[PDB]
Amino acid sequence: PDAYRFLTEQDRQLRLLQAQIQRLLEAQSLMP
Amino acid sequence: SAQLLKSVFVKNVGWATQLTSGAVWVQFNDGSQLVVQAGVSSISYTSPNGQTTRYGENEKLPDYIKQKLQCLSSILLMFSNPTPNFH
Ligand SMILES: [Cl-]
């Protein structure tokens, strides 16, 4: 993989993780 | 193949490790092991007794796993590069 395209996509994948867990924590507030 | 990319330590919590694939592997100081990945809606949590349990998007989790996820969201701050992007 390229240096720019790798490092940008890894920090992009990390941002998506934070948000996914944030939805999940909210989803749990509605459950069950 | 998913290689280990960056490893971080959190006192008095444990160690978190970012993998190439977009995964995050936390190994808590209580014997617990949370695994989480971007794109994947499921979360795998291993407990001190050694049992590994996968949990889907719409499965009610116990507080002990929710607390470790809260904590994992805070550990995710330590792999973030704050340098501004240009070009
Ligand atoms: Cl680790």
Residue numbers in the entry:
A (entry chain B): 720 to 751
B (entry chain A): 884 to 970
Which lines from the publication concern this structure?
PLK4, the master regulator of centriole duplication, is the most distant member of the family. It is distinguished from all other PLKs by the presence of a third C-terminally located Polo-box, PB3, in addition to the two central and closely linked Polo-boxes PB1 and PB2. Here, we demonstrate that monomeric PB3 of human PLK4 adopts a canonical Polo-box-fold and directly interacts with nanomolar affinity with the central STIL-CC region, STIL-CC. Most importantly, we determined the solution structure of the human PLK4-PB3 and a crystal structure of the PLK4-PB3/STIL-CC complex and use structure-based mutagenesis of STIL to demonstrate an essential role of STIL-CC for PLK4 binding and the regulation of centriole biogenesis in vivo.
In contrast, plate-like crystals of the PLK4-PB3/STIL-CC complex diffracting to 2.6 Å resolution were obtained using seeding. The structure was solved by molecular replacement, and refined to Rwork/free of 0.22/0.25, respectively with one monomeric PLK4-PB3/STIL-CC per asymmetric unit. The NMR structure of PLK4-PB3 in solution and the crystal structure of its STIL-CC complex display a conserved overall fold comprising a six-stranded antiparallel β-sheet (β1–β6) and a C-terminal α-helix (α1), which packs against the β-sheet and contacts residues from all six strands. PLK4-PB3 and STIL-CC interact along the entire STIL-helix and form a substantial interface of 934 Å2 buried surface area. Two regions on PLK4-PB3 contribute to the predominantly hydrophobic binding interface: First, the surface of the PLK4-PB3 β-sheet around residues V907, L917, V919, I926 and Y928, and second the α1 helix (I948, L952, L955 and L959) and the linker (L944) leading into it. Key interacting residues on STIL-CC are leucine and isoleucine residues (L733, L736, I740, L743, L744) pointing towards the hydrophobic surface of PLK4-PB3. Additional interactions are provided by backbone–backbone hydrogen bonds between PB3G922-STILQ739 and PB3K943-STILM750, respectively. PLK4-PB3 reveals a novel binding mode by interacting with the helical STIL-CC region in a leucine-zipper-style via the α1 helix with further hydrophobic contacts to the central β-sheet. Overall, the structural data reveal two core differences in PLK4-PB3 induced by STIL-CC binding: first, strand β1 is N-terminally extended by three residues to the range 888–893, resulting in a shortening of the unstructured N-terminal region in the STIL-CC complex. Second, helix α1 slightly changes its orientation and is stabilized by STIL-CC binding.
